[PDB]
C-alpha cells in the first residue's frame, strides 16, 4: 500500500507548494538559474508489522523527507522560516487521502557544502489494513 | 621584468580568446549586520559587467538523484578584482567563485583564473 | 536441502513470470536493448537450526530477493505497481512444491544509481525435517 | 578568432571520422505533470536522427553478477543540442548522456563530446 | 521554535562579544590579518519531545557551540582564560529572551592542526510550549 | 576513411605479430532453460579455433594462499566476433573474456583487444 | 593438541576425497587447466577452555572449513549435490582417530565472484584431556 | 662545483623575478619559559624585512563553512635563514613556514623555497 | 578550573624534570640533535559533573599524558626504567598545588614507528568546588 | 612493576630457546638468510586493578605474545610442533623470578601472508603488591 | 617475426648486463603427499645453477618493528623455465618468485623477468 | 661491462657533486646480548667518517604538534658499506638509514643511495 501512501503525500505537498520550485523523484530537474531556494521531496520506505496471529492484519510505515536547499552566502533565517512553515502544515494526527500521520515534522541539523546548504525536514505516515 | 609588458600581453591574449556575444556579470555583496534583537539585516548587491574566456566544463552527481548541474573554470583580465565568495553569471546561471587563482608574480594580480562552481546545488 | 527449496522458488517465480525479462544466477544475461524493466532473482541462504536433543530434527531457512530494475528518468509509479503485484503473489502461509513461506514479501527502500534504480523485494522460506 | 572557421573545421573532422552506416538516434522527453490526486502523467518522447563518431569502449562489473554491459563516449557536431539526461541509441542499445561536455570558447557549443552510459543497468 | 531560540542565543553572544572577531553562520568571514584569536559561533539543533498524550505539549532542545581559535606557536594559557570567561557567562538556569539554559558551558578537548587550534565550548538551551 | 584499408592494415599487423604454433580456441555456449519443476538443463558449447597475439602477463594473489594463476590480454582480428562472457583457451588453460574492447570507429569491430582473466580461480 | 586434531581431520577428508582436485594448506596448488570443481581445505583454531579448579582439565575446540568451487556459467546443481555428499560424511558424534565432532557440517551462504563461486561448509571438533 | 657561482646565479635569477613594491617581512620569536608557579612568560618577537618571489596560490575549504583563506609558496635568497615555524607576512596577512626546503648541495642553504600556510585558520 | 589544574600538573613535571629534553604544548620544539630520549607532555580535558540539585557543586576531571620517546635501534630497558621512575612520582592521593590526583600512573602499550618509539604514561586529576 | 616482570619472562624464553633465532623489541634484526623459523617476542601491558578501599593494594597484568614465523611453501607441521613445545613450557601456576603465570599459553589462528605465515601464542602474567 | 633472432638478441643483452661472479641458484620442489594416517611427507628439492641480471632493490617495513629485509627484481634467459612458487637465491638469501612475467609473443618464453620477494619475512 | 669503469665514473661524479666542508660520520653498532637474569648489555658503537652528496629535503608533521624535523636522501660511494639500520649524521643531527638502495648490477654495490630518516622523532 506504499503506492497510495506516496500518492497521498505527493498530493498534499503539491497542494500547498505546487508553485514553489521543487524536485520530484526520477524526473530530470534543473536548479534555478538565478540561484535560489528549491525543495527536494524524498519518500523513504519502512517496515510492515504483522500485528496478528491469523497473519491477516498488517500495517505499513513510511518516512517522508522534505529538504530546503538554499545558496551559500545569503544567511540562515529564511530557511528556518520556510522550515517552520512546512512543519506547521504537517502536524500530528492529520488524515490524508489514505492513511494518517504517525509522527509530526522535526526540523533537523543543517547539512553543509560549498555549493549549497540543506535543512532536512521529515515526518511519518501509517496505514492499517 | 617589465610587468606592464606581461600585463598587456595577457590582456591581448584574453581579448583574443574571448567571445563578445557572451554576457557575463560580476555580483558583489555589501555589508551585513544584526539588529539589537538578534535578527539580521540582508546585504545589498552590486552588478558589474565583465568579459572573459572559459574552459573545462565538468558535471556533477548527487547520490544518483536526477539533478543536472555543471561546473566551469574561467580566465579574466585585470580590470575588476575577483575575490573568493563572489558570484559570476556565465550565461544566466549563477556561479560562485570558490577559488580565484591570480597570476602571482607581483602586487597587481595581472590576471585571474577563477574556479566557478554552480550555486544552489545540494551536496 | 537448500537445493530443493531453491528449485521450488525458481519454479514459482518462473511459473508466473516466465515471459518477463529476468536474470537467473550464474547465467550470462544481457539487459534489454531499448531499456526497460527486468527482474533480478537472487537466493540467499541462512541458518540450519537444531531443534532437538537427538540431533535428528533440523530445519532450513533461506531468503529470496526479487529486485525490480527500471531506467532512470521514467519515474517511480510503475515500479511500485510491479512490486505490489510481486508481493501479492508471495503471501504468508503459501505451500510450495517443497517447503513453505515463513514470512511474506516486504517492499524495501529504493537503491539509486545514475544508470538504473532498483526496488528490493524479499521473502523467506522454511522446511522441517 | 573566427569561430565560424573553427566550427567548419570541427564539422569537417567529425564528418571525416564518422561511419554513415551506423544508425544513431537522439531521444528527448517532453513535459511531465501530476493530477489532482497525486498520480503522474507519462511524458511524450521525440526521436531525432543524428550521426557522429565514438571512442573508448569500457565495460561494467556488478558485484560479481554475470551481467554484461558496456559504456562508450562519442563526438558530435552542433546540429542538435545535446543536454544532459537525454537518451542516445548507438546501435539499438539505449545510452543515457550523463555528461555532455561542449567545446567551450563561445556562445554556440561548436561541438559536443557526450559521455554515454548504458541504461537499465543496476548499480 | 528553533528560529526564535536561535535568535535569542545570537543576541546574547552579540551583547557581550559584539566587539570581537567572530564568524556568524553563512556569512563571508575573513580571519584577522595579523593573526589572532577569533570566535566561531555554531548552532546545532536537536530533538523535540512529545511530553503529553494530547499531543499538544512539546519542548525543543538545541546545542550552541562557541569555539576559540588561536594561532599555533603562541601557547595555551590565554585560550583557557578566554574559555573560562565565556563559561562564567553562560551559567545554569539563565533567563534568555525566550527559553533557558538546560546545561551550562563545558570546556572540551582541544582540536589540533598545523594552521590553528580550537577549544570547543558548548551549552544547551530549552523552551517549553 | 577507407575503413577497409584500416581493416587490412590491422589484419596484416596482427598476423605479423602472432606465432602460428600457439594453439588457441574460442568457446561459445548455447541456450539455457528451466524445466517445469524448477531444475535446469545444461547448455551446449561450441569450439571455434582462432589465432592472435598476447600481451601483459599479470599474476594473482588470494589472501596469502599458495594458489598460482595469471591473467593475459590479447589482440585478435575481425574473423570471429568475441562477445563478453566467452571462454578463450590460450594454451590449455581456459580464460574468460571479461571485457572485449573493439576498435570503435565503424559498424564492424575492425579488431578486438579482449581482456582475458583466469577462470575457476577464487576471489 | 591442535596438531593431532588437524591430522585426524586431514585423515578423514582424504579418505573420501583423495581423488577430487583439492588444496592443502601452505603447498603450491594449481587450479585445474580445464576449469572445474576443486575443494579447498582450511583448519581454523578456536578456544581452549579450563573446566576445573586444579587447572588440569582442559578441552580444545577447532573449526574445519571445506569449500567447493565451481566455474562461472555452469550453474548450481553439482555444487549442492557435492555439498550434500560432504555433509553426509561429517555427521554428529563421529569418533575420529583422536577426537570427536562436537557439531556437524552445515551448508553456508554462497560467496560469489566473477572468476569462481564457492559454497562454504564447516564443522567443529573437540578433545577432552 | 664552484658553489659561489651557483649562489650568485640563483641570487640574480631570484632578484630578476621579484617585484620590489611588494612589502614582505620575516618574524622570529625568542626564548620562552615558565615561572615558579607553572604559568608562562610570553616570548619576544623580531621583524626582519625580506624580499622574494611567490608561486602556486591555493585555496582552503573547512567543512563547508564560509571561511576564505589561501596558501602560497615562495622563493628566497640566502640572506636571512628561514627555519621552520617562523612567520612571513606576504602583504599584511601572516603565513607560517610549515616547511622551508633549501637547495641542498652544500653547507650554506644557497636558496630557500619555503612552503607558506595561512595562519589562524581553522582545521 | 582547568587553568589551575593544568598549571599544577605543569608545575610538578617541571619541578622534577626541568632538565630532561621536554615538549610543552604549542611551543616550537626541536628533537635532540644526537638522538635521545625526550618527554612529551600533553594535557587532555574531560567532563565536569553536576553533583547537586542546587546546580552549584561541580567537579572537574582531566587526563595528563607523559610520553617517553626513544630512538629505534637502542633497545627497551631504559624506557621502562624511566616509565617506572615517572610512575613512582605521580602516586595516588597526592596533593598538587590546586586539586589532587584521583588515579595513579599506569604504563601503557608501546606505540611503534620506524623513526621512533613511544611509551605512554598517563594519570588523572580532580578538583572539587 | 612492568619492568621487572618483563625481564623474568625474557629470562625463561632465553633459558630454553636461546639457540633459536629471535627478535627482541627495539633492537634491529635480520631474518635468517637461508630462510627458516624465527620467533617474535612482544610484551603487551594491561590494566591495573585497585583491590582495596585504602588505595594501597594494586596488582599488574600483562600479556606476552610469542609468534612462530615460517616460510610459505614448506607446509604446516613443524610450526604446530614448535607451538606445542612453546605451550608446554608456559603452563599455569608457574612462578617466575618476580611473578607467576595467571593463564597459560593458547595457540591462536594462523595469520597468513604471501611472504610468510605466523602462529600467535599468548599467555598472561600477574603480580600482587 | 624471426623469434629466433629476438631470442638470440635477448640472450646477448642479458649476457652483456650480467655479472659472472655473482652466484645464483634455482631451487625447485618435487611431489608432496599424505600417508594413510593423515600425516604429510616432505617433498624433495633440486638445485639448478643459473645466471642473470637484477634491478630495483626495495626495502620492507613491518608495523614499525626493527626487521630488515629487501626485495629485488631480476632478468633471465630461456634456459631453465621459472614457474611461480620456486625459490631463487641471489647471493645466499633465498627469494621466492611470486610472479615470473615472460616475454609474451610466442610459445617459448623467450625471456623471464621474475619478481623476487624475500622469504621467511612476516607480512 | 667494465664495471670498474662504471665504478670510477660514479666515484668521480659523486666527488664532483659533494661539498668537502660538510662533516658527515657513519655510526655502526656492535654485538648485543643478555645476561642470565634477563637484563641486557648495551652494545658498543664505532664512528667512521664519510662524505657524499644529499638531495630532497622533506619535512614531517605529527598530529598537529609543533615538532620540527626533516628527512633527506643521500648519495655515497662504495668505500664503506652502508647496511640498513645504521646511523648517519648529516651535520650533527642523527639520521637512521631505513633503506640503502645500492646500484644493482654486480657483486660490489658500486654506489649507495641511502634513504635517511630523522631519529628520535615520535610516530
Author numbering:
A (entry chain Y), C (entry chain V), E (entry chain N), G (entry chain b), I (entry chain T), J (entry chain Q): 1 to 129
B (entry chain D), D (entry chain C), F (entry chain B), H (entry chain E), K (entry chain A), L (entry chain G): 1 to 123
Cite, word for word, the article reporting this structure.
The T1 connector complex is composed of two dodecamers (a portal and an adaptor) and two hexamers (a stopper and a tail terminator). The density maps enable us to build the atomic models for the MCP gp47 and CPs (gp48 and gp49), connector complex (portal gp52, adaptor gp45, stopper gp44, and tail terminator gp42), and TTP gp41. The comparative analysis of the structural characteristics among T1 and siphophages reveals that the majority of protein components from the head to the tail in T1 exhibit structural similarities with those of reported siphophages, which suggests that they share common evolutionary origins.
